[PDB]
């Protein structure tokens, strides 16, 4: 149908602001600590701890499948990475702290591009 196209073009368009709101965010690690899933290999016991592990690389295979509806599943993986860093970490290590620069930083990029879904629909 014609309505089924016009909704994969929002979708796409979605994909499109997602993509750029994961490049604003990634940009807030440049320790590169939460690009990648925690090695289970190293961590061995990461899942007796963290039981839904998340990280910018498999966010961005969700996000090119275009496997985000709404920008609130998205912000759940970011928050899953922030808050599986917190909990796994103690709070005098580099990585909880990186978790808190992350959070602190991508608030902003986050408020603005709920205005920006709300406001092109």
Do not use: W
Not at 62 to 67: D, I, K, P, T
């Amino acid at each position: 149908s014609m309505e089924q196209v016009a909704m994969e073009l929002r979708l796409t368009e979605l994909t499109r602001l997602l993509r750029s709101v994961l490049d604003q965010l990634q940009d807030k690690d440049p320790a590169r600590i939460f690009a990648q899933p925690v090695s289970l290999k190293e961590v061995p016991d990461y899942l007796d701890h963290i039981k839904h592990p998340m990280d910018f690389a498999t966010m961005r295979k969700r996000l090119e499948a275009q496997g985000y509806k709404n920008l609130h599943e998205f912000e759940e993986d970011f928050d899953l990475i922030i808050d599986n860093c917190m909990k796994y970490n103690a709070r005098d290590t580099v990585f909880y702290r990186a978790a808190v620069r992350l959070r602190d930083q991508g608030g902003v990029v986050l408020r603005q591009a709920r205005r920006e879904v709300d406001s092109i629909g």
